[PDB]
Every structure is written in structure tokens, then in C-alpha cells.
RNA sequence: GGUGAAAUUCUUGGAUUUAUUGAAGACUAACUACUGCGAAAGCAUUUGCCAAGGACGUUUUCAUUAAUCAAGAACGAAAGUUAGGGGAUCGAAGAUGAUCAGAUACCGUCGUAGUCUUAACCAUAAACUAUGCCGACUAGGGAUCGGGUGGUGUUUUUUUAAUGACCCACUCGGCACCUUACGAGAAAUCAAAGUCUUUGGGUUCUGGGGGGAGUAUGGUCGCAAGGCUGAAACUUAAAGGAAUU
């Protein structure tokens, strides 16, 4: 259900004579009998786990934390890493660039693998017959295959109904609607094709 | 065309100088004559009051009217005001540029333009690109009229330039490299560094522009304006 | 006519053609 | 002795799915299953398991890298970049 | 003894700009420029309607307080001009005549180092 | 001139017309003999064998001091490589190119200099199997090229 | 450079190839430098550390893999480490 | 026919140069077919310095001079009448 | 704000302008030249790495391994195409402002594709020096680029050694240039476009009046746009080149 490759990285527990298994989300490079060092005071090499806080400014990582003991938030898809901006020295906060990118401030004590996610480049071959897509859904969820609303009846979906296949209202709904006219857009500032800049 | 707007106000006195008041600037004990001038500002209020609005500029002087002279002409000295004391807001040293006459006075053609820049640190933690020029020059007895070099007496000199920058930089607080760089003895050192490659003339530093300031430190501003 | 403008016309009209070809063959 | 002049490897799917996405998928599917070399040993043993896993025979190390890829471009930019930032940051 | 500010005369064609500032350059006095003097739209530029401007710039920064500036004569810079205006060299004779004493003249006309692209296409400006 | 290139610079040796010389010299031929198959032993190819004999000792060429050339007397002692020396250092001028264009393969001023070095080697090769000093089945692998310059 | 006096030292001198060999020659102490690439598992390098250290002989480093050893040797192969028998005719025992 | 040895101008060993653009009607012309006019015109207009010398603070001595380089067209430099047409024997003239 | 003049458009919601910064992409002025390199296209910030190349110096080596080229192969401006990233200026289309009898043209303001880059295609140009490549000879003059040689030459550090940078003389390869016309050409002009009716150094390609026509068809390459090869029927007595008045 996940296109990224997962790395079991077992640890020492520092207050019991154990040994205790950590799954992290294998980033590119990652190689089996690795030593990872995830800390404060450990080195930039690919797959550390250090803070934000601690590390110089256009820094690439992954599974970032929102918050600090979150233990994985942001970046885990594969092909998808965070880039490190700034950093405040006075009330400690940390700039980054999503992949989405969409601007954010998380703390100076959330921590992040280093690395690029592994798989990346997933979505770059087309499905080409129906059974590999079936395939994929099947081990996510039940949204496969999918029917559109404009060729159901009028009681089924508000878009269908009529002799026609036409939706007949507008298909941007807005943001304030209750559940049941949320079928289309969902405030859409815009609509049509995004020729030019995003203007992000 | 006073006549000719339709559309003044779409949405349907008092002279604002009556609420401003003069303020005194001054400068660091580097340049000699402080008396650097005055500047308005709006009259201290319970909102946003002077000194807020006054602790961040940067007024820019020539550093012939610092020094008294005028062999400095050419040289204009940026200071940032960034603390006041009750009507003589204090400044400090922000960078310093080679004005557009100068500049583009001894950039002539046939003659080599040789140019470098450095990223150094300063003992008080003052991050500083400086940039320096320097011309080739037509040495006497020459009749041949491009005094050109061969682009590798350019490489050479410039790693001369970029190591004699350091070296006189990195050692060196940011008010000892102020009062080193107006008797400009760092050209002095250029030309003793780079004669056995190409004569070279007009040697200069060009910009000496900040990038990162350090901690605020009251304690040294008021070392500098004694 | 201009050489570019008299290439372009034969050009148009030569796509022209290929595509009244196109439905026969 | 050539069987297929430019289908190459997606004979396959034989004349469906249109031409562009059979050239697409080529393209994708002749580097999922080329044969790569550990950097471990040197040996041209690396072959490609499960989405973005690829493990060997031999020396048996296995690498997380790209879907169809044993090293990403991009990957491989970032590791250059992040290289380049340790030594600046460590000198 | 006497108190500077600066001019910032912006020459252009079409337009000039006469615009007063004190020596930190965030207070300003006395923008008035040469579009307000001329009623025909094509001598805001002229040197006839820069001396008007100016005799008002140097009277509003009299009553101000400010005696003598400093002058820093522009164009438009950019990628588009790069030569003054035909009535900058008119605004900063007008101010100097009306008592107001001048110096240290600058040039901080904005020169690229070849950044972006000039508007007109690789035919120019055909009329 | 210049096979591969557009250059016209002439620039060679002027051999005197002395065919016996250079007179002031007093040593043997034996003793020039004797080393040059010292250096031969030691990995050096004809031309550096010819270059450090010319600065160093008083030999000017070894044909006028000796009866024979130095590839000549380094066959008959037995220290001819298998290959000739040419064509040698053009295979391993060319898995160089190889080697350089198998990691910066955006480099296309190599690749026409590849080609160029392929083509003056195929040409050499060629005379040289004519000539009877080569296998008449030899051939250059780019694959074994690496392991032919050993 | 070095490829050209390691292919000097294999026409030349005393040559053996692998590792199992090579521990050999360093127990019976008829081994004078020994050539490791870069590409070696770190714990057989390690130990042929050891092995060096134990019978006063000199370690170098190969910049490549097992591949680039095996052809500076000349060799169509991979070879891992390299001991050096006798030096022959060429100098690698004495410089570098 | 052939007018002139260097045909579009000084260019003969390169084959192709980066072009700038004129100053005028910003028509894009090669960097060596440009006419190039240096301006060394003082800041001021002509007189009118003894006006400013007046009232002029500091014992004056600034008198700053512009420097600028002007790149023309060929149809640019001949309208502005700058650049000349002239005859066959004064056109071999440099 | 802009134009010859205007207008669209932006302006009490502060336009334009000024001052302190930040972000994004593009680009490599001035130095920049009858200057350099590269097979051509082309290449201008600094530093590091990778391999490559011309010239020069050489009493080093091989030895005729060479020159030109059907077929065939590599590179090949801009524009265009495929799939991502990027997308600030300019800007095929398009939307308006005008001018004009008409203006979906020139001018003004916006603006998509594109302009940048990654991977794969496109094989075109006034891709021109409209002058194929190799070799030999032939009127003089100066400047300049790279290397080399000589002159107690000048300057430079420690006045004075070296080296470096300059002056003079010479040499090899260059980008080229000035004056003449033995000689050539229809002339314009040419140090080759000369050494061709005193016709012969080696080799490749192309053209046989102007249109039809680089069109039609047949092959071939390409995702397409298009590239390569490539007529005929029919029509005309003229087109075309250089100069003179």
C-alpha cells in the first residue's frame, strides 16, 4: 500500500539489556548493515536523524516532524524531501520549503531524516491495462474503479439525471456548502487550465 | 496634467511637519569629524514612539566631509544608525562604495581589468565580501598601445589580491579594518604583493559591503562613539 | 511574392493535399 | 536476430495501449530490468526486487534507491549537495 | 552649521522627478514634480516646466528648515534609457538659483549587469 | 599536414649531416649498448630511451654512435614490447576518452575526439598488420582496449 | 605513476594475486608491500592491516575497485589486494 | 554587388559574436556591427557652472562627469545623423 | 504611465517616487578590440575537478603508415515536438488602445505557447569569406596573437642575481590589414578570384536559357511539423550579372 521501501533499524535501549526494533522509511542510499546515528550531536550523512536546529541552511531531509516528539509528519512519500531555508537564533524556528511548496515554520527541535525518500520517480510509467491499477487500489482501500456522477441518476448524484450527460449546475461548489452539494470543485478560486505561473 | 485625472477617489490638513522633530547624527571615532547632520523623524508618541521608528537606517556620507580631506572624495562611507541616545542617534560602519564617477573613470579600453572578491570573518564575527580592481598599465619606454596580459598573470594576481585581502582582514576587528582602509595601505600592500607579475596600476578596493551582523553588543558602540 | 511567404503557401497547400489524401488511402 | 526492429522488450502488449505509452513504458521497463553492479564488490549482480528495493545474489547487500533506477539523478544531486554542506559545515 | 539633505532629481523623457529627502532618506519633503506645472502632457519632461518644479521644492524645504542638500541627478534606468532626462540638468540650475546651495553631485542612474531583456523585439521600435 | 586537424605548423628535428659524430665522443658502442637495454629493462619505451641518452650522456643519436637504431637493438636483445609503441599510447590516449565520457556523457567535444582517435587508430593498425607486425586478425576492442594497455 | 610501476613490477618481479595468497605471503614473511583497493570488504582490510602490521611489511591504497586493480595489474579479473614478492626490476618498493 | 571587404562589419576569424541592442528604437544588432559612441559629457549642461560654483558648498573642485556608451543601429545612426553616407573613395576611408 | 500627438491602464483602497530588506528566474555590460579558441554551429563572472587540442622548442622514436572522397557515420544556430522541473523580463497567437477611407499592420498597455534546464527527437539558415580540401611558386610595407632565439638593452624586487613586464633584431604558425597590378576577370574586384587558347600538380561535389518546380508521384527518415532523392506535360524569347549617362 506504500510505493516507499521501509528499513528496520533496531537499536540499543539505553536503560534495559534489549534490543529494540525502529521501522524508518528507507531513503535513497540507505544500505543494509548501515550504522545510522540519530541524535543532536550526530554528523550530516545521508539517513541521520538530527533536528532541524542543528544543521546549516539549504539542508535536504525527510520525514520531517510538525512538532517536536511527533516521531514523522511531513515527507514521507517516495521521491519527496524538505529543504531547510533559515533558522531564528531568538525563539528557535526553522524555515522550510514542503514538496509541496507551501512555506513553513515548525521548531528548532523537530527531527529529520537525511536523505531523499527511496522510489522516487514512481508515477513516471503509465498503469497501461486495468489490473495493474486494480492491483494497486486492492492493497489500499476500496475507491477503485470509480463511477462519475454525471451518468447516475438524479437521486445517485446531484450531476445526474436528464436525457442528456451535462452536470446542469455549476460545478464549483463552495467552501461553506453542507454535506451532500459537495460534488465537484470545492472552492475553486480558479478554474480551467493553469496556463502560465502558479503564483505560488 | 492637473486637468486631466477623472477618477481621484475611488472609495467615495494640518502640515505634517509640526509633528516632527530634528535629530543629530554621529559617527564613529574611525572618521575624525563626527558631525555628520541631522534627520527628521516623527515626534515620539505612545504607538510606535521615535526610537523604534529611528533604529533602523542607514545614511550615507562621503568620507572626504569624515575625514576633513578630500583625496576621499571618491570614497563614500554608508553608516546604519542602530541606537539612540536622546537626540544624537549613534551609527556604525555598514559598508563602503566607490562612487559611479570614479568608477567608471579608470575603467578605460586597452587595458586589462583585473577584479576579485572575498568572503571573510572578522574577529568581532562581522561576515565581509570585499571586493577589490585593479588596471593594467603601460609601462615607460612602451610603444605598443593594448598593454594587455595573457590570462594568466590575471589568475595569478587575483589569488595575490584574494590571499593579501584575507590575510589583512581575517586578524582584524571591524574598527580596525575601518581605520585601515581609509590610509588605504591595503593598496600599498597590492602593489608591493603583485609588481614582480604585471606593473598594474590604479589598485583599489571597490565595496567592503556587509552581510551578517553579530550580536547587538551596546557595550562596543559606546567603546566607538567615546 | 517574398520566397518565405511562397514556401509557406506551398506548405499549407501541401498539407492541404496530404489531408484530402488521407481520407482516400 | 532482431525480432522486433523497434518494439524491443513491450511486444507484449502487442498492438494495445497506444504507441506512446508502449514507448514510455520501454523506456521505463529497460532500466527496471538491466543488471547493475554492487558498489560493494564491483560484481555486475545488482538486479531490482520490489518498488525501489534492489538487491543482489551474490555479495546479498540491498539499496534503497529509485523505482526503476539503482541511483536517481536527483538523489544523487541531493547526496552531492548534502556532501558538500557536511564539509563546509565540519571544516 | 548648516544642515544637507539630498535631491534625488529623477530625469526621464515625459516625466521628471524632483524629490528632497533629508541624509538617512526615509523623511521626504517636497515631491513636487514637473506634471503638475504644464497643462499639455508633452512638456512634463521639458526643461521649461523642471525650472517650475524645482522653485517650489526649494521654497517647501526653506520653510522646512533644510538650507542645502545634496544632489543625485538619475534617469530611468533599468534597461530602457540609461541617459538623463532633457530637463534634469534644468531642475538642478532652478534650485540652485533660488538660494538653495547644492553639493556633492551624483550620478545613481541604475546600470544592469545584463539582467532581464529589453522591451522591443529583435526588429526594434519600427515608426 | 596535420591528418586530423586543420593545423599547417611544421616543427621536427634538423639531424646534422655528419653520419658519423659527434666526434668529441669517446665512449664505446658496446657501453652505449649495455645501456641502452638498462633503461629498456626498466620499462622505457624507445623514445624516452633515445630522449634521456640525448640530455644525459653524450650520445646525439643512436644511430651514427651505434650500427643499429634503438627499437632494432632492443628486438635483437629481446625487449621488443609486443605491441608497437604507437600505437600503444594512441589505445591508451583512447580508453582515457573512454573513461572520461563513461561518467560526463553530455561532453560531445569528446565524443567527436574519440572518434577522431578511433579512426588514426584503425589507420595505424591497419599498416601495421600489412607490414607483417601485428596478428593479421587483430583488431581493437573497445571492451579489451583497457586490458591491452595492461 | 603508479599504474605503470605496478605493471612494471608484474613483467618484472614476483607477483601473487588474491587475498587467501596474499595472507600467505604475510605469514611466511616473503612480502614487502601490499596493494589494497578501495573497494575491499573493511573487515578483510582490516585484518590484512593486521597482517601487515604483524610482519613489518607497507600497505597502499588503490583509488578504485577491484575492477581498476585488476587492470592497472593487468589482469581481466577482479583483484581485491596485491602482494608484492620481489620488486624486480621496477621501484615501487623504494618510492611511494 | 559587393560594397565593402568587411561586409557587415569587423568581423573576420569569429563567425558569430553576442548582439546588444540599440539605444534608440531597441533593434537587436551584432556587438561588432554596432556603432559605438563614447559620452563623456559633464553632469551639467554647458555654462552654467559659474552659477553652481556660487552656491556651491566646499571650494567646489567636484564638477562630476557621466561616462556612457551608446550602441546605434544602422538605420538609427544614419537617421540621428551620426553616422554618414559618403563616396567610394571616402568610404575605403577609416 | 507612455507616444510625433493621444488613449487603454494604474491612482484617498496612496498610484508614481524615496529608504531598509527578502524571494524568484534570466543574464555575464563597462573591460570588448580589422583581438583569441573551436571541424562547423559556437564559446566572455570566480574557484575546484575531468579529459582534450593548436602552435612552438627538440641532434627523441616509428617509417611511407599519405592527400581527396560514392556508400556510411558523429556534431550541427534559432524555431518546433515528447515527458518533468522551472517560469522573473521579452514575447508567434489572442484581448484592447489608437492613427487611417478601410488596419485583426507599423505605435501603446496586458498577455498563453515559447525564451532557462533535465532525458529523448527534429538534420534546416544569407549554416556566407555566396570563394571545397591538400601541395608548390610568385610585388613590397607595417601592425597584431601564440611559442622560440639573440642583443653588459630598459624597468622591476634586496639600488645591483635570477624570473616577470617592456625596447630592438630574427624566426615558425595564425586572425587579419595597407599600397601597387607582373597576372587574372564581363566588370565590380582579387596575394588569389594569379602561375587557364604558351590551355595537364592530386582529388570530391554541383550547373547547361527563364517559368512550371524543388511541384506531382514513387521510395526513405521522423510522434508530428518536415528532411533526402526527385520529374513530366505545358508556356515563353527573353530572364539574369557587372558597370556608364
Not at chain 1, 532541524?52 to 541552511?57: A, H, I, Q, R, T
Not at chain 6, 650520445?59 to 651505434?66: C, E, F, L
Not at chain 8, 571587404?5 to 540599440?22: D, E, L, T, Y
Request: glycine fraction near 8%.
Amino acid at each position: 500500500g506504500r510505493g516507499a521501501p521501509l528499513a528496520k533499524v533496531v537499536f540499543r535501549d539505553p536503560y534495559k539489556y534489549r534490543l529494540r526494533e525502529e521501522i524508518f522509511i528507507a531513503n535513497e542510499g540507505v544500505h543494509t548493515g548501515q550504522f545510522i546515528y540519530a541524535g543532536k550531536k550526530a554528523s550530516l550523512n545521508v539517513g541521520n536523524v538530527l533536528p532541524l536546529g542543528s544543521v546549516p541552511e539549504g539542508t535536504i531531509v525527510s520525514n520531517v516532524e510538525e512538532k517536536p516528539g511527533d516521531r514523522g509528519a511531513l515527507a514521507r512519500a517516495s521521491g519527496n524531501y524538505v529543504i531547510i531555508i533559515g533558522h531564528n537564533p531568538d525563539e528557535n524556528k526553522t524555515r522550510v520549503r514542503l514538496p509541496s511548496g507551501a512555506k513553513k515554520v515548525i521548531s528548532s527541535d523537530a527531527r529529520g531524516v537525511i536523505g531523499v525518500i527511496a522510489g522516487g520517480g514512481r508515477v513516471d510509467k503509465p498503469l497501461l491495462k486495468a489490473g495493474r491499477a486494480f492491483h494497486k487500489y486492492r492493497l489500499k482501500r476500496n475507491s477503485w474503479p470509480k463511477t462519475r456522477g454525471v451518468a447516475m441518476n438524479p437521486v445517485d448524484h446531484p450531476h445526474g439525471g436528464g436525457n442528456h450527460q451535462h452536470i446542469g449546475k455549476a460545478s464549483t461548489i463552495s467552501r461553506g456548502a453542507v454535506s451532500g452539494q459537495k460534488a465537484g470543485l470545492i472552492a475553486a478560486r480558479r478554474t480551467g487550465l493553469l496556463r502560465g505561473s502558479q503564483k505560488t | 496634467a492637473v486637468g486631466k485625472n477623472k477618477r481621484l477617489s475611488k472609495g467615495k490638513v494640518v502640515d505634517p511637519f509640526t509633528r516632527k522633530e530634528w535629530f543629530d547624527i554621529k559617527a564613529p571615532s574611525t572618521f575624525e569629524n563626527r558631525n555628520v547632520g541631522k534627520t527628521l523623524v516623527n515626534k515620539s508618541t505612545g504607538l510606535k514612539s521615535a526610537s523604534d521608528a529611528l533604529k533602523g537606517r542607514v545614511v550615507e556620507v562621503c568620507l572626504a566631509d569624515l575625514q576633513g580631506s578630500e583625496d576621499h572624495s571618491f570614497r563614500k562611507i554608508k553608516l546604519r544608525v542602530d541606537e539612540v541616545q536622546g537626540k544624537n542617534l549613534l551609527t556604525n560602519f555598514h559598508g563602503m562604495d566607490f562612487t559611479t564617477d570614479k568608477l567608471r573613470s579608470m575603467v578605460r579600453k586597452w587595458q586589462t581589468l583585473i577584479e576579485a572578491n572575498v568572503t571573510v570573518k572578522t574577529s568581532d564575527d562581522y561576515v565581509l565580501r570585499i571586493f577589490a580592481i585593479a588596471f593594467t598599465r603601460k609601462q615607460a619606454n612602451q610603444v605598443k598601445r593594448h598593454s594587455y596580459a595573457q590570462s594568466s598573470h590575471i589568475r595569478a594576481i587575483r589569488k595575490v589580491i584574494s590571499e593579501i585581502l584575507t590575510k589583512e582582514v581575517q586578524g582584524s576587528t571591524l574598527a580596525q579594518l575601518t581605520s585601515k582602509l581609509i590610509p588605504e595601505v591595503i593598496n600599498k600592500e597590492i602593489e608591493n604583493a603583485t609588481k614582480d607579475i604585471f606593473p598594474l596600476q590604479n589598485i583599489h578596493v571597490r565595496k567592503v559591503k556587509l552581510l551578517k551582523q553579530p550580536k547587538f553588543d551596546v557595550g562596543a558602540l559606546m567603546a566607538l562613539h567615546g | 511574392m517574398r520566397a518565405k511567404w511562397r514556401k509557406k503557401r506551398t506548405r499549407r497547400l501541401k498539407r492541404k493535399r496530404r489531408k484530402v489524401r488521407a481520407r482516400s488511402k | 536476430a532482431k525480432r522486433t526492429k523497434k518494439v524491443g522488450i513491450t511486444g507484449k502488449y502487442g498492438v494495445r495501449y497506444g504507441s506512446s505509452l508502449r514507448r514510455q513504458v520501454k523506456k521505463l521497463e529497460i532500466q527496471q530490468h538491466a543488471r547493475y553492479d554492487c558498489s560493494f564488490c564491483g560484481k555486475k549482480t545488482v538486479k531490482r526486487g520490489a518498488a525501489g528495493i534492489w538487491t543482489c545474489s551474490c555479495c546479498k547487500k540491498t539499496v534503497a534507491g529509485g523505482a526503476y533506477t539503482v541511483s536517481t539523478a536527483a538523489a544523487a544531486t541531493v547526496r552531492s549537495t548534502i556532501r558538500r554542506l557536511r564539509e563546509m559545515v565540519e571544516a | 552649521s548648516q544642515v544637507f539633505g539630498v535631491a534625488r532629481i529623477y530625469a526621464s523623457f515625459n516625466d521628471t522627478f524632483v524629490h528632497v529627502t533629508d541624509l538617512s532618506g526615509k523623511e521626504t519633503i517636497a515631491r513636487v514634480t514637473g506634471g503638475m506645472k504644464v497643462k499639455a502632457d508633452r512638456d512634463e519632461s521639458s526643461p521649461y516646466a523642471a525650472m517650475l518644479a524645482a522653485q517650489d521644492v526649494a521654497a517647501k524645504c526653506k520653510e522646512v528648515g533644510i538650507t542645502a542638500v545634496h544632489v543625485k541627478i538619475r534617469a530611468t534606468g533599468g534597461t530602457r534609457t540609461k541617459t538623463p532626462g532633457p530637463g534634469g540638468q534644468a531642475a538642478l540650475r532652478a534650485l540652485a538659483r533660488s538660494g538653495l546651495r547644492i553639493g556633492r553631485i551624483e550620478d545613481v542612474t541604475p546600470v544592469p549587469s545584463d539582467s532581464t531583456r529589453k522591451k522591443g523585439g529583435r526588429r526594434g521600435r519600427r515608426l | 599536414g596535420r591528418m586530423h586537424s586543420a593545423g599547417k605548423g611544421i616543427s621536427s628535428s634538423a639531424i646534422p649531416y655528419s653520419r658519423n659524430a659527434p666526434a668529441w665522443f669517446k665512449l664505446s658502442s658496446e657501453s652505449v649498448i649495455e645501456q641502452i637495454v638498462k633503461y629498456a629493462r626498466k620499462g622505457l619505451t624507445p623514445s624516452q630511451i633515445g630522449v634521456l641518452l640525448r640530455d644525459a650522456h653524450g650520445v646525439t643519436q643512436a644511430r651514427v654512435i651505434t650500427g643499429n637504431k634503438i627499437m632494432r637493438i632492443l628486438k635483437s636483445n629481446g625487449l621488443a614490447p609486443e605491441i608497437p609503441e604507437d600505437l600503444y599510447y594512441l589505445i591508451k590516449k583512447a580508453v582515457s576518452v573512454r573513461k572520461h565520457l563513461e561518467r560526463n556523457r553530455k561532453d560531445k567535444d569528446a565524443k567527436f575526439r574519440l572518434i577522431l582517435i578511433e579512426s588514426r587508430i584503425h589507420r595505424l593498425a591497419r599498416y601495421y598488420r600489412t607490414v607483417a607486425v601485428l596478428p593479421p586478425n587483430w583488431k581493437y576492442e573497445s571492451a579489451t582496449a583497457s586490458a591491452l594497455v595492461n | 605513476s603508479i599504474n605503470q610501476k605496478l605493471a612494471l613490477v608484474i613483467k618484472s618481479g614476483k607477483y601473487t594475486l588474491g587475498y587467501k595468497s596474499t595472507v600467505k605471503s604475510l605469514r611466511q614473511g616473503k612480502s614487502k608491500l601490499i596493494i589494497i583497493a578501495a573497494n575491499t570488504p573493511v573487515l578483510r582490510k582490516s585484518e590484512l592491516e593486521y597482517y601487515a602490521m604483524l610482519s613489518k611489511t607497507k600497505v597502499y591504497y588503490f583509488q578504485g575497485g577491484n575492477n581498476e586493480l585488476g587492470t592497472a595489474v593487468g589482469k581481466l579479473f577482479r583483484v581485491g589486494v596485491v602482494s608484492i614478492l620481489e620488486a624486480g626490476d621496477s621501484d615501487i618498493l623504494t618510492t611511494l | 554587388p559587393k560594397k565593402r571587404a568587411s561586409n557587415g562589419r569587423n568581423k573576420k576569424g569569429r563567425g558569430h559574436v553576442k548582439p546588444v541592442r540599440c539605444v534608440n528604437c531597441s533593434k537587436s544588432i551584432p556587438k561588432d556591427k554596432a556603432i559605438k559612441r563614447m559620452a563623456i559629457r559633464n553632469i551639467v549642461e554647458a555654462a552654467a557652472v559659474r552659477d553652481l560654483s556660487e552656491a556651491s558648498v566646499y571650494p567646489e573642485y567636484a564638477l562630476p562627469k557621466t561616462y556612457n556608451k551608446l550602441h546605434y543601429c544602422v538605420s538609427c545612426a544614419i537617421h540621428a545623423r551620426i553616422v554618414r553616407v559618403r563616396s567610394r573613395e571616402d568610404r575605403k576611408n577609416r
